[PDB]
Design a protein around this ligand. Sequence first.
Ligand SMILES: [Cl-]
Length: 207
Amino acid sequence: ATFEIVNRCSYTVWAAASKGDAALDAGGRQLNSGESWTINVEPGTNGGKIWARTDCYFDDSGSGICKTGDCGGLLRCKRFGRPPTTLAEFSLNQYGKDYIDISNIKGFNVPMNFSPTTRGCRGVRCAADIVGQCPAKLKAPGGGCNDACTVFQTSEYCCTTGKCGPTEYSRFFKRLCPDAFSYVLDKPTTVTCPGSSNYRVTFCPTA
Ligand SMILES: [Cl-]
């Protein structure tokens, strides 16, 4: 199924859609303000994230760097990004039931929306100004709020034991985005949908 990845910001991002060990369709392409981009995630992709990388520079070959969502310099993102990232997590068909969700488990970088394109379900969003209303010890240097996990690296933040709960750093991403995973275990905000359904991943929605 398809995934329109719309840039709606004022600044050029570099979208990216990948899984564990493989890119999706192409991998990730530059996006001037308003540029739309269509791809086709192979049906049955478990572990599919789409995100945006800001302040990236490249060369001909396809090898550079990104202040956010960097993934080994590979414009065509094969891996997941370097943490500080708002993710459109998804797993597709999964027993005739599709699964999508925004997440601030790996921080936040870009107000995102993950609406479905069909008549299958409602979508989600994460529009609020996190990066601005950031708590001091998260506002990353580059730009964007890292997550407590990546910043501090405690079991309580990154959830190793299995038994973890909300925090003040997780209750910041919740206060602002009530419809995205703050901590790794949060009362799932996932939305289930029909299998073989398409999606719009509008970065910077509402303007
Ligand atoms: Cl890091």
